[PDB]
Amino acid sequence: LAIGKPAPLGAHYDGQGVNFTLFSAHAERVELCVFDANGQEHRYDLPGHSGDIWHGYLPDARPGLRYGYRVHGPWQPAEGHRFNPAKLLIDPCARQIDGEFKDNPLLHAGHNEPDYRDNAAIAPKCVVVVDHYDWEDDAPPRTPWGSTIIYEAHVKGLTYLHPEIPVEIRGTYKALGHPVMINYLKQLGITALELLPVAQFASEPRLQRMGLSNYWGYNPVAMFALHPAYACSPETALDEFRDAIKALHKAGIEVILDIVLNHSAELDLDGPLFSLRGIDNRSYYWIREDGDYHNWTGCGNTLNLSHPAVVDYASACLRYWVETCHVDGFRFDLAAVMGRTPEFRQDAPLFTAIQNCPVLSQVKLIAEPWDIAPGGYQVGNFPPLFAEWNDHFRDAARRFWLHYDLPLGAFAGRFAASSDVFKRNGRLPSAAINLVTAHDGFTLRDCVCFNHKHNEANGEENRDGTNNNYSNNHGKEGLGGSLDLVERRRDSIHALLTTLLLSQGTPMLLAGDEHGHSQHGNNNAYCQDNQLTWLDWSQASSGLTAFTAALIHLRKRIPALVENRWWEEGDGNVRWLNRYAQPLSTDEWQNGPKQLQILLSDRFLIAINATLEVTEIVLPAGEWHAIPPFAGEDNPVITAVWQGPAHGLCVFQR
C-alpha cells in the first residue's frame, strides 16, 4: 500500500486508486480489508499514521470496491478499550454500505474476552464510490425564519399509501419530489419539510427478535450513508434523493434532516460491533470509571461530542449533507449531548466548530434541547444560532384546551413565543419551535380520542411511551362515537391547530395532523412500519386539510407573527382582553375564567373560550367579521358579541 494522505476523512478515489483515511487514537495497527469476486479477503496494513489519523493509498482501486477495517489494539474491559481484529469493522465515514444488518451472534465483540469468530461472512461491507452528480442551478431557498412553517414527516409513511403517487415510488425519496407532493406541500403552505432520520440505520437486535423493525430510524450505523431502504434505486439512492431535493427547492421548499449524533447502532456492551467500538471505543464514547458506557442518551451509548477527533468527524458529517446533498438545515435528536463536555456548555467544541464553520453556520440549526441524564435538561440554553423544540408548548397547549387546569397567564406566555425562555441573548421569537405533537407521542387526533396509551403492539405491555399525554378522549376511549363526540372534539382539534399555527414563534405541524391521522392510541410507534403509522390518504379529511391550509395562509398575513420581533407592552403587536373586551387585570390572569381575546396588529382578533360551557364574549371596538376557515370568505356577518362554543375559539378581522 502506498503512503497516501491523512485526509480527507474516509475513502476517496482519484482516478489512479483510492486514498483511505481512518481515525484512532488508541489503535496499534490498522488493516485495510479488501474483497475479491470469490469473497476471498485481502489485507494490507495502512502505511500512513499522521497524528491520530491512519492512512494509505491503494493504486488502481476502482469505485465499487468492497472493503472494511480490522483494528488491533488493547482489549482492556476495565479501561474501555475494545479492540478485536477478529471482527470486520465498517468505515465510519463510508458513503455507501453493501449488505443488511440482520441480527447475528457473530456480531458481538465479546464481554470480558474478545470473541474470536470471524464475522466477515455476515458483516456488511463498505463500497468505494465516486460522486459525479450535476447540481445544475439548485440554490438554497434561504426562507426567512419569520415566515417558516415546518412539516415533520416520515419518508415512507408520508407517501406509501398515496393514491395519486405512482405505485412504484410510494414510500421512497422519489415520491417526496413527485408533482403530487410538491403541489400539496405548496397548497398547504409549509416552507420546510423535516424528515425523520435518513442516515443509514439498522433495526436493533431486540427489535428483530420481536418480529419488529425500527421505523423512525434513530439508530444510525453509517452517518455518511443515505438509508437505502427508502430508495427506489438502492445502489444509487443519493442521486434519487437529490433529484427530489432539486424539485422541492424549485418550488421554494426547504429540506431539514432529523439527525442523531448522540449515539450509534452499536448500543451497549451487549450490542453488535459495527465500527466505533472496535476502532476506538475510548475516544468515540463517553466511558465511566469502570469501562462501561455512560448511558446519557438512554440508547446504550453516548458519543463524546466534545472530543476533537469526534468534533471533526461530526462536523465533517454535517458538512457532507449540506455540500453533497444540499439540505437546508438540521434538527438534532437529544441535542444536549452536543454541548456535553463532561457538563453542558454553550461554548462546547461542537458548538464553536459549527458556529465557525462557514457552511454549517449558514443553515438552519434546530435542537431537542436535552438528554435523559442529570444536567441534560437544557431548554433555553443553546447557542444563539440554534432554535429549540418547545416541548413545554406541547404540554401547556394540551393542558389549556384538554384539561382546563392551566393558568390563563401561562398560556398567554406560550403564545407569545415563550419569551421567559428565549427572550435572552440576541435570540428572536423564532428560536421557539412550537409544536402540539410530533413523531413521538399521540397524533393530534389521538389526543382527543384517548386518555391512555395503547402500545401493546410494541411488545412491552404498555410500559413504554410517555405517561404524561395531557389528553382527553372527550367521553369515550377510541376513535368514532356519537355525532356529538365527533363535533365536540372537532372543536378542540380546531382550537389546538389554531393555537399552533397562530402562536408567535416557528410553527411545526406534524404530517397527517391536517387530516385526522391516527395511530390508534399508540403513543410511541417507533417500531411500527405498517398501517397505524403510514398516512392513510384515501381516508384523509379534506375539510380539516383546507381548515389547516387557511390557517397557515392567514398567518402569513398577520404582521405580528411574520416580523419575528419580540412584542413590547403597547407597541401595537398585541393586546390581551377579557370577556368584556377590557385589558385583563391582575386577578383575571391568576384565577379568572379561561376566556380572552388576542388582537394582533390591531386588525386580527382571536376569541378564546377555554371553559366547559358556551359563553358570550364582547368584542372590541370596530366591525369584526369572522374569517376563513371559521367563516366563508367575504363574510358579511358583523360580530359584536361572540357566542363561543365550549373549549373552542374563532378568529376575526376588521
In whole angstroms, give the CA distance from residue 244 to residue 163: 19
Q: Please, which residues bridge with residue 54 across strands?
A: 22, 49
Residue 333 is among the residues annotated as catalytic for this protein:
yes
What type of residue sits at position 612?
L
In whole angstroms, give the CA distance from residue 371 to residue 340: 10
Residue 229, Ramachandran bin (φ over 0: left; ψ between -120 and 50: alpha; else beta): alpha
Residue 258 is among the residues annotated as catalytic for this protein:
no
In whole angstroms, give the CA distance from residue 226 to residue 325: 10
User: How many residues does the structure list for the chain?
Assistant: 654
Q: What 8-state DSSP symbol labels residue 79?
A: G
Catalytic one of 333, 388, 446, 514 = 333
Q: Please, which residues bridge with residue 21 across strands?
A: 55
Cβ atoms of 64 and 125 closer than 8 Å: no
Cβ atoms of 86 and 116 closer than 8 Å: yes
What b/e readout covers 586-621, taking b as 16+ CB neighbours within 10 angstroms?
Answer: eebbeebebbbbbbbeeebbbbbbbbeeeeebbbbe
Neighbours of 401 (CB within 10 A): 29
In whole angstroms, give the CA distance from residue 573 to residue 593: 24
Cβ atoms of 195 and 257 closer than 8 Å: yes
From residue 602, alpha-carbon distances to 147, 314, 606, 652 in Å are 20, 47, 11, 11
Catalytic one of 152, 240, 328, 368 = 368
What type of residue sits at position 237?
A
Q: Which residues are catalytic?
A: 333, 368
